[PDB]
Amino acid sequence: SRRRVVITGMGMLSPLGLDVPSSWEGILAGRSGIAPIEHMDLSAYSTRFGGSVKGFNVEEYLSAKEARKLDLFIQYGLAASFQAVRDSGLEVTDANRERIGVSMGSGIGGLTNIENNCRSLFEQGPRRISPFFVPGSIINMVSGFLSIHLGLQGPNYALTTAQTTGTHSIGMAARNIAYGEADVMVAGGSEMAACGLGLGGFGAARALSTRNDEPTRASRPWDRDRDGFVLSDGSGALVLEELEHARARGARIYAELVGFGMSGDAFHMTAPPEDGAGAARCMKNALRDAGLDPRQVDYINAHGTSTPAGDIAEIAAVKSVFGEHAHALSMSSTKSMTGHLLGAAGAVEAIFSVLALRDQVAPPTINLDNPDEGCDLDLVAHEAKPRKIDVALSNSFGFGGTNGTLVFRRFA
Amino acid sequence: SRRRVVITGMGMLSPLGLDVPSSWEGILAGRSGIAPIEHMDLSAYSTRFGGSVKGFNVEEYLSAKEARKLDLFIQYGLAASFQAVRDSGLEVTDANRERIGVSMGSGIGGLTNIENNCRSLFEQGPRRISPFFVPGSIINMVSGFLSIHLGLQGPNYALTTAQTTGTHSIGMAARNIAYGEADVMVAGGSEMAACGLGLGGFGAARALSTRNDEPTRASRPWDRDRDGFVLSDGSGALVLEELEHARARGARIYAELVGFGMSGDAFHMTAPPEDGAGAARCMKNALRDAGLDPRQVDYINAHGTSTPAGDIAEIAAVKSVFGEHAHALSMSSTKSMTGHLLGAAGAVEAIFSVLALRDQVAPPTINLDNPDEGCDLDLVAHEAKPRKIDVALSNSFGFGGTNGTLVFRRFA
Numbered sequence: 001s002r003r004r005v006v007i008t009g010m011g012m013l014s015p016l017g018l019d020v021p022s023s024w025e026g027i028l029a030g031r032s033g034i035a036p037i038e039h040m041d042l043s044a045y046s047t048r049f050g051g052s053v054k055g056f057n058v059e060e061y062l063s064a065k066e067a068r069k070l071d072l073f074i075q076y077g078l079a080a081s082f083q084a085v086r087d088s089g090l091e092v093t094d095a096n097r098e099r100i101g102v103s104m105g106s107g108i109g110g111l112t113n114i115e116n117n118c119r120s121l122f123e124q125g126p127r128r129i130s131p132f133f134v135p136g137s138i139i140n141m142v143s144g145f146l147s148i149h150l151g152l153q154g155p156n157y158a159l160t161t162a163q164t165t166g167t168h169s170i171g172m173a174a175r176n177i178a179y180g181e182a183d184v185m186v187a188g189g190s191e192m193a194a195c196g197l198g199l200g201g202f203g204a205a206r207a208l209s210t211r212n213d214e215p216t217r218a219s220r221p222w223d224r225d226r227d228g229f230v231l232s233d234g235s236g237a238l239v240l241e242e243l244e245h246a247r248a249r250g251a252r253i254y255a256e257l258v259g260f261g262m263s264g265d266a267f268h269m270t271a272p273p274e275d276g277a278g279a280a281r282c283m284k285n286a287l288r289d290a291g292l293d294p295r296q297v298d299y300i301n302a303h304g305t306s307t308p309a310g311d312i313a314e315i316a317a318v319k320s321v322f323g324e325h326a327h328a329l330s331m332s333s334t335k336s337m338t339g340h341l342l343g344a345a346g347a348v349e350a351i352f353s354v355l356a357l358r359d360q361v362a363p364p365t366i367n368l369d370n371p372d373e374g375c376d377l378d379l380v381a382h383e384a385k386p387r388k389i390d391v392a393l394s395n396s397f398g399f400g401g402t403n404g405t406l407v408f409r410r411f412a
Numbered sequence: 413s414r415r416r417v418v419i420t421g422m423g424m425l426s427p428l429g430l431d432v433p434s435s436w437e438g439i440l441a442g443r444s445g446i447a448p449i450e451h452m453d454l455s456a457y458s459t460r461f462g463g464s465v466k467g468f469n470v471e472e473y474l475s476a477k478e479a480r481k482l483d484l485f486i487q488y489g490l491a492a493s494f495q496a497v498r499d500s501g502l503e504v505t506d507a508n509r510e511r512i513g514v515s516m517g518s519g520i521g522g523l524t525n526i527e528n529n530c531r532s533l534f535e536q537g538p539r540r541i542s543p544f545f546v547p548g549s550i551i552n553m554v555s556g557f558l559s560i561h562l563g564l565q566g567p568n569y570a571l572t573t574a575q576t577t578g579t580h581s582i583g584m585a586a587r588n589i590a591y592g593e594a595d596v597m598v599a600g601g602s603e604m605a606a607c608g609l610g611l612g613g614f615g616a617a618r619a620l621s622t623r624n625d626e627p628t629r630a631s632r633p634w635d636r637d638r639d640g641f642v643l644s645d646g647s648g649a650l651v652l653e654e655l656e657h658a659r660a661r662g663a664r665i666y667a668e669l670v671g672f673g674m675s676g677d678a679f680h681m682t683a684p685p686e687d688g689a690g691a692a693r694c695m696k697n698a699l700r701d702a703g704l705d706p707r708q709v710d711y712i713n714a715h716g717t718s719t720p721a722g723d724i725a726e727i728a729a730v731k732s733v734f735g736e737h738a739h740a741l742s743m744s745s746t747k748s749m750t751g752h753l754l755g756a757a758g759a760v761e762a763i764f765s766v767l768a769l770r771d772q773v774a775p776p777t778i779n780l781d782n783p784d785e786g787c788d789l790d791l792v793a794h795e796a797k798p799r800k801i802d803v804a805l806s807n808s809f810g811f812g813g814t815n816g817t818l819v820f821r822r823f824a
C-alpha cells in the first residue's frame with residue numbers, strides 16, 4: 001500500500017507574473033507574456049523574442065552577495081521555492097527536518113553564467129573565471145541552497161530531463177512521500193536559457209518560431225500556421241505533503257496528486273512519433289497509477305509546444321487513450337500565453353492544472369485561429385471555459401523521447 | 413509490495429581501462445590512471461593533469477556519423493551502458509521493452525561541446541552554433557540515446573546531483589524496480605569535464621590538487637600532504653533487475669542491492685561539515701533500509717576525494733555510525749588511483765564495491781604514506797587486502813550537501 005499526497009503550497013515566476021495569482025490572472029484573461037528580448041543584441045539571430053521574467057527583484061529573497069554567486073535559473077528556482085514554502089504555512093522544526101526534502105530541476109541550467117565565464121576565458125584566460133562558477137551554475141544548487149537556507153535534511157536531488165524536468169521532479173517527489181521516504185517535498189523546476197547559446201542553440205536546430213513581427217501570435221499550438229516553440233524563462237515550485245501530515249497541522253489543501261506516469265518513446269532525439277505512441281503509454285500508465293478510467297478525465301494541460309510534429313502527436317495520443325471521451329474532456333496549451341519554459345514548463349503547468357481544479361475553469365489555447373487537419377478536439381480556443389473539472393492531467397514530452405504525466409484530483 | 417533488486421551486468425570506461433575487467437585489474441594492482449593532460453594546452457592553468465580515458469574508440473559502439481554529434485560524456489555513458497546490457501545477457505523484446513528503463517546521470521554534462529559552441533558564438537556568430545548543440549550536450553541524452561538505440565520504453569530520466577550523481581542514479585533506479593515501476597533499469601553516470609571551463613572553474617575554486625610535477629601521487633586520500641581532488645573522466649553503468657525476473661531467465665547475479673540512503677547536510681554550498689553529520693545520517697538511513705546490524709558491514713568504498721575537509725568528515729561519520737566496529741571493517745578510496753569522476757564517481761565505485769564482493773578483496777588506498785590526525789582506521793593503505801566481505805557500502809557526497817549511500821551484499 002501507499003500514502004496519499006496533496007498540494008499545500010505553490011510558487012512561480014513566469015512571463016505573466018512574479019507569483020502564482022498574477023500569472024493565473026493572465027492565464028484566465030488570455031494574456032501573452034511574449035515580447036522582443038531586451039538588453040541583448042539579437043540582430044544576427046533568427047528569433048528576437050521570448051517569454052522573459054519582468055521586474056524580478058532577487059533582494060526580496062537573497063542578499064546581493066548570495067545573489068552574485070548564483071545563476072539566474074537558481075535565483076528563479078529559489079524564488080518559486082520560498083514562495084511555495086511560505087504559501088504552505090509549514091513550520092520546519094528539529095522534529096520534522098529529516099522528513100522534508102527538495103527536488104527542483106532544470107533542463108539546461110546556468111547558460112548565462114557559462115556564457116559570461118566563456119567570455120572571460122576566451123578574452124583573458126582561466127584566471128578570470130569566477131570562483132563560484134561551478135557551484136553557482138550546477139543544476140542541483142536550487143535543492144542545495146534551499147535545503148541550507150531552510151535546514152531541510154530529507155532527500156535532496158535534482159532531475160534534468162529536458163522539457164519533462166518539472167513534471168518528473170513533481171512525480172518522483174510524490175513517490176518519495178507515497179512510499180514513506182519523506183513527509184514533505186518541495187518540487188518543480190526553473191530555467192533561464194535566453195542567452196546567445198539558448199536562442200542560438202534552438203535556432204540552429206530551426207526549432208523556434210521566427211514570427212519576429214508579431215511575438216504575441218508566435219505561440220499558436222495546433223494552429224495550421226505554427227512554426228515552432230517560443231523560448232521562455234521562469235520557475236514553478238509545489239509543496240507536496242502526506243495527507244495525514246497536512247490534516248494534522250490544518251493545512252489548506254489545493255488538490256490531491258493521485259497519479260504519475262513515465263515512459264520513453266525510444267523513437268528520435270528531438271521529434272515525437274507521429275501517432276504519439278509514447279505519450280499514449282505515459283498517460284495510460286498515469287491513469288493506471290491513479291486507479292482511474294480514461295473517462296474520468298475532465299481537463300488536460302497539454303505539452304502543446306507549437307511545433308508541427310509535437311502538437312499533432314498529442315492529438316493522436318489523446319484520441320488513442322480516451323476513445324469516445326476524447327471530445328468530452330477539454331485540452332489546452334497554456335504555452336500559447338507563457339511560451340515554453342523547458343524544464344520549468346511542467347512545474348508551472350502542474351500549478352495551472354491545480355488552479356483549473358480550484359476555479360473550475362479550463363484555460364484557453366490563445367492564437368488557435370485555424371485548427372490544423374485533425375485538430376478537432378475541444379482545445380479551448382481563444383477564451384477560458386468554466387466547466388466541471390474533477391480530474392486534471394498535465395503532460396510533458398522532452399528531448400530523448402522522455403514523457404511524463406501527472407494526474408491531479410479535487411480534494412474534499 | 414517491495415521487490416528485491418540484483419546486479420546482472422556492469423560496464424565501464426575509466427582512467428584505468430576501457431572496460432570493467434581491465435579497470436579492476438588496475439585497481440587491484442594499485443595502478444594510477446592520472447597523467448598530464450594531452451588533449452589541450454594547460455600552460456596558463458594551475459592544474460595540468462587528470463584521469464583521462466586513454467585510447468577510447470567510439471567506433472566499437474557507434475557510427476562516426478552519430479559520434480560526431482555527441483559530447484564525449486554521452487559517448488562514454490553509451491559505451492558503459494552497451495557493455496552493461498551485453499554483460500547482462502538480457503534480450504529486449506516487445507514483451508518486456510515497456511518494463512526496461514534507464515537513469516544515466518552527469519554532474520556537468522557536455523561542457524566541451526558547450527565551450528566549443530560558445531567559442532563559435534563569440535568569434536563568428538550564432539549562425540555557427542551546431543544544429544546538434546542542444547541534444548548533443550544536455551545531461552538526459554545518455555538515457556535518451558540509449559533508449560532510442562536499444563528500444564527501452566520504461567522510465568527514462570537523468571539525475572544531476574554533482575559528485576553524488578552516480579550513487580543517486582543507481583539507488584533511485586533500484587527503487588523504480590523495488591516499487592514495480594520497472595523490472596530492469598540501466599543506471600549509473602558519465603562525465604567529461606576536462607576542458608578549459610572545467611579545469612579553469614574547479615581551479616578558480618582552488619578545489620584541485622596542484623601537484624603538476626608528480627601527477628600519480630596527487631590523489632592521496634587521508635594523507636597529511638593532500639591538497640585537493642584530481643579531475644577524472646569516464647562512465648559506469650549497471651543493469652539492475654528484479655530478483656524473480658533475473659532468476660526466471662537464469663541470469664548471472666553479481667550481488668544484491670539491499671540498501672539506499674539519501675540525506676542533505678543543510679550546511680554549506682561546497683564544504684562538508686567537519687563532523688560528517690549528513691554523511692552519518694545517510695549511512696544510517698541506508699543500513700536501516702537494508703535491515704542490517706551495522707557490524708555486518710565489512711568494506712566501505714569511501715567518497716575519499718583527497719580534500720582536507722572531505723576526507724576527515726568521512727572518518728568522523730564512519731566512527732559515529734559504526735562505533736567500535738569502525739576498527740574492524742576496511743575502508744578505501746579507489747579515487748587514490750582513478751581520481752574523481754564527479755557524477756560518474758558513484759557509478760564506477762558501485763562497480764568496484766560489487767567486484768570487492770565477487771573477489772573477496774578490499775582495493776587499496778594508494779599514496780597513503782602519512783595518515784592525517786584521527787585517520788586511524790583500516791584504510792587499506794598501499795596494497796589490496798584479501799578479506800571476508802559479505803556487505804559492502806559505497807558513499808558519495810556532493811555540492812549542495814547532497815549525500816548518497818548504496819549497500820550491496822553477496823547473493824547465494
Ligand SMILES: CCOC(=O)[C@@H](F)[C@H](O)c1cc(C)on1
Nearest residue numbers: 108109110137138520521549550
Ligand atoms: C547546453 C546544456 O547545458 C547544461 O545542461 C549546462 F548547464 C552544463 O551542463 C552545466 C555547466 C555546469 C557547471 O553544470 N552544468
